[PDB]
Amino acid sequence: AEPEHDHRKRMGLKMLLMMGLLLPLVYAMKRHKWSVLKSRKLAYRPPK
Amino acid sequence: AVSASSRWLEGIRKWYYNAAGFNKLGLMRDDTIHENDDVKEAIRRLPENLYDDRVFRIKRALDLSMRQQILPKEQWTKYEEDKSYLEPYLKEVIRERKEREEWAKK
Amino acid sequence: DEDAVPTLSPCRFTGSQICHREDGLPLAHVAIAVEGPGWAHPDNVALQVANAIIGHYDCTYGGGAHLSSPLASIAATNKLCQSFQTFNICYADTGLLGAHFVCDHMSIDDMM
């Protein structure tokens, strides 16, 4: 029914291991760029 | 005159105000209004002081919404202190449109 | 002469932005600088050579298109600018090195 079964799962491990690397790293990249905004301070200084 | 029923009517209004939660972001009621044509005209008519206060309040709220944070409880807008600053501008804009619409009928 | 002097502590530079948004004002002012070295440092001279190449501009200069500086030439041709200036402000062991400019609201992105 499924000759691909063994290859599918070897690929499956390789995916999860890569995603375990790539997901935190891309997250750290998005956190880096978004830092500028997430730590921004506003002040309102109207006349009088 | 009116005492006991009024405070309960006010109580449901105050309850809903807190559950609405725009006050956690420092928004007034009139800051949250959907900008149709009537509303955009009302903004345009606002005096300098009120216009600029409105923008700062939106900015501070969008900033909080981005960080998924809210103000400290001290700094939430109190239902009693909520200024309906747009309403009389908006009411007049609506009154003006409705007169044009009556003239267009005849 | 006598006891308690301080010498100057070194001043940390921070890569940062301050944005005073004021739309009532007719022209934008932008100043941008990297960390210079101090007064003492020999490479102030070569930085000044470089700053002279970028130069200064003002809307009352003769020469639009023909000015040697490519910033000055393009700013004049494309109307990017009312003025710009390079600077190398020096303090003890630190500085402000870069540029200041004054322009229309629709010209800031091009000027940068």
UniProtKB/Swiss-Prot annotation, chain A:
Family per record: Belongs to the cytochrome c family.
Subunit architecture: Component of the ubiquinol-cytochrome c oxidoreductase (cytochrome b-c1 complex, complex III, CIII), a multisubunit enzyme composed of 11 subunits. The complex is composed of 3 respiratory subunits cytochrome b, cytochrome c1 and Rieske protein UQCRFS1, 2 core protein subunits UQCRC1/QCR1 and UQCRC2/QCR2, and 6 low-molecular weight protein subunits UQCRH/QCR6, UQCRB/QCR7, UQCRQ/QCR8, UQCR10/QCR9, UQCR11/QCR10 and subunit 9, the cleavage product of Rieske protein UQCRFS1.
Name of the protein: Cytochrome c1, heme protein, mitochondrial
Organism: Bos taurus
Compartment(s) where it occurs, according to its Swiss-Prot or TrEMBL record: Mitochondrion inner membrane
Function: Component of the ubiquinol-cytochrome c oxidoreductase, a multisubunit transmembrane complex that is part of the mitochondrial electron transport chain which drives oxidative phosphorylation.
Disulfide bond entries: none
Parts of the chain on the Mitochondrial matrix side: 39-48
Residues passing through the membrane, by range: 5-38
Gene: CYC1
Section of the entire sequence shown: 278 to 325 of 325
From Swiss-Prot, chain B:
GO biological process: one example: mitochondrial electron transport, ubiquinol to cytochrome c
Residues found modified as N6-succinyllysine: 73, 83
Cysteine-cysteine disulfides: none
Keyword Acetylation: yes
Classification via Gene3D superfamilies: Cytochrome b-c1 complex subunit 7
Topology relative to the membrane: Peripheral membrane protein
Any Pfam family: UCR_14kD
Chief location category: mitochondrion
Location in or out of the cell: Mitochondrion inner membrane
Superkingdom as given in the UniProt entry: Eukaryota
Keyword field contains NADP: no
GO cellular component, as recorded: mitochondrial inner membrane; respiratory chain complex III
Coiled-coil intervals, chain numbering: none
Family membership noted in the UniProt record: Belongs to the UQCRB/QCR7 family.
Function: Component of the ubiquinol-cytochrome c oxidoreductase, a multisubunit transmembrane complex that is part of the mitochondrial electron transport chain which drives oxidative phosphorylation.
Assembly with partners or alone: Component of the ubiquinol-cytochrome c oxidoreductase (cytochrome b-c1 complex, complex III, CIII), a multisubunit enzyme composed of 11 subunits. The complex is composed of 3 respiratory subunits cytochrome b, cytochrome c1 and Rieske protein UQCRFS1, 2 core protein subunits UQCRC1/QCR1 and UQCRC2/QCR2, and 6 low-molecular weight protein subunits UQCRH/QCR6, UQCRB/QCR7, UQCRQ/QCR8, UQCR10/QCR9, UQCR11/QCR10 and subunit 9, the cleavage product of Rieske protein UQCRFS1.
UniProt-recorded name of the protein: Cytochrome b-c1 complex subunit 7
Lineage: Eukaryota, Metazoa, Chordata, Craniata, Vertebrata
Curated annotation (Swiss-Prot), chain C:
Disulphide-bridged cysteine pairs: none
Residues of the full protein shown: 258 to 369 of 480
Top-rank lineage group of the source organism: Eukaryota
Record-stated family: Belongs to the peptidase M16 family. UQCRC1/QCR1 subfamily.
Quaternary structure note: Component of the ubiquinol-cytochrome c oxidoreductase (cytochrome b-c1 complex, complex III, CIII), a multisubunit enzyme composed of 11 subunits. The complex is composed of 3 respiratory subunits cytochrome b, cytochrome c1 and Rieske protein UQCRFS1, 2 core protein subunits UQCRC1/QCR1 and UQCRC2/QCR2, and 6 low-molecular weight protein subunits UQCRH/QCR6, UQCRB/QCR7, UQCRQ/QCR8, UQCR10/QCR9, UQCR11/QCR10 and subunit 9, the cleavage product of Rieske protein UQCRFS1.
Cell location: Mitochondrion inner membrane
Protein name: Cytochrome b-c1 complex subunit 1, mitochondrial
Organism field: Bos taurus (Bovine)
Primary role: Component of the ubiquinol-cytochrome c oxidoreductase, a multisubunit transmembrane complex that is part of the mitochondrial electron transport chain which drives oxidative phosphorylation.
